[PDB]
Design a protein around this ligand. Sequence first.
Ligand code: SF4
Ligand code: SF4
Ligand code: SF4
Ligand code: SF4
Ligand code: SF4
Lengths: 79, 84, 76, 296
Amino acid sequence: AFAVHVNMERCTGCNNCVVACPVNALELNTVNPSSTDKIYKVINGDAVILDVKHELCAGCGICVDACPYDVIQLSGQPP
Amino acid sequence: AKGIVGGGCNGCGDCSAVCPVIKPNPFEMGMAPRKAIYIYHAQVMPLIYTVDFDSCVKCGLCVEACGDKKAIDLEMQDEFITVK
Amino acid sequence: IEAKIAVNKDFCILCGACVNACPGEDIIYLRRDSVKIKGKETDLFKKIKEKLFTPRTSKVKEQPSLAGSVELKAVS
Amino acid sequence: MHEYAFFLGCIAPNRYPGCEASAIKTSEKVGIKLLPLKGASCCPAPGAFGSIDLNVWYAMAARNLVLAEEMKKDIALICNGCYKSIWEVNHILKHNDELRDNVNEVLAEIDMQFKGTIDVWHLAELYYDDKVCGVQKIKDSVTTPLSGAKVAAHYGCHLMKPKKERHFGDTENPMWFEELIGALGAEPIQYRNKMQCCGAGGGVRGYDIVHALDITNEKLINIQEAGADAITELCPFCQLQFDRGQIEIKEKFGDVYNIPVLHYNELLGLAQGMSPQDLALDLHAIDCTPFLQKVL
Ligand code: SF4
Ligand code: SF4
Ligand code: SF4
Ligand code: SF4
Ligand code: SF4
């Protein structure tokens, strides 16, 4: 239930934070999908986090490790 | 009254000698440690050794230290009395 | 085709890091049955046994009021 | 992109133009748009002009306010003294009816009225606010780390004091400006009596230069003892004092510090990659070259 922050100023729209998030990958890549909500979607060229109320993230670091030009900061402390 | 003939609390101090929790003493404005089972100072009038239930971990060492006196009831609850 | 993940019960120590880390919904099911101790026992230790021995599994979309920490699913 | 009228008083445009240039560039890089103010003048400088006549102080500050009122925009500032004049006259004339009346019948001779419809902000206050660009956005915009530099902050007096008249919180040991310098990557250091006046306020800079320089020298001694490599500031008065006054201290006394004095907007430009030539660091009395060697 952590909080992710995306630096819009250096986001290129690469979409490798959307493809690599394992909560996004739940809908289409799971047998009998449990939850179909998504943290990121690239609207107007930058990654927007729809997870406003910080309910779905799991601090996995797959998205921080994925962005090619580090731009996603993961906060492990309560918002 | 509850039936323990041997008595209740005589203020020996074994309970606080064995309690492992350590918290600030409000009587000493926080400068000094006191266990979870405690008295403010040695000159308190009811020398009866309150248990601080917000900080007790129910380790049960205090009851073993108290022994046959059986003064410690870790499950006690807030009783209500009406007085005219 | 293939499996995507599996475990070796010979080496799993029933810690719980896997459950605490998985972002999935209920991929993992953890339940401990007996802790092995030396030293006799305590009422506190019986409470702690009861707390450690409740089955658990992952969860997506936990409550926001506790944002910044983890909450698992209580399995009946 | 939030839009503000950019007041731009006397010292930044006419002595330290790199300050205003970096202000516009860095504010645009973060989500802020700084629009020129059309025919603004000296905010009647609170010391040297308020000491003479409070009524003409009110009238000139109100004229500056009604320019941006006609523009229908919120003032943005980069000077603590200009903040005092503009913001405080705005606040006083938003609540005092007889003073509104007096200023309005003075301004009616130039076809111009004050109604009190806009708000006044300091640029560092905007950089700190979370609705507008926040500390995190500043960190995002920073592209050159400026690491390994000890930087001493001078808050000034007219931004934060008196706290019964402002809204910035504690005046005894604020840390907000230290967070903006920490965002840039430079480590802000703490020195003795960090909230002391620089000595240039109230017209003392002009009336008694030795007295003002002694007040400044107390600060410079504390800052050198701490070990600063530059002094950030949010006021062109204080920058002028700390910059010229180092030269006047070197000549009137025998004290040498050679500590560069930079506005926070100049440091923000350096962090965001602007060039020293584009910042006009050659227009300062005290050479910035050692600090540039350290942070570049
Ligand atoms: S930390 Fe994991 S679950 Fe959270 S947004 Fe990143 S990839 Fe998704
Ligand atoms: S991976 Fe990084 S650069 Fe790509 S969209 Fe996500 S945040 Fe932006
Ligand atoms: S509670 Fe028991 S052990 Fe503690 S002081 Fe009283 S009698 Fe002694
Ligand atoms: S039960 Fe409470 S008071 Fe008694 S020893 Fe344990 S922590 Fe101390
Ligand atoms: S994370 Fe813990 S419970 Fe899961 S397999 Fe490894 S040791 Fe076993």
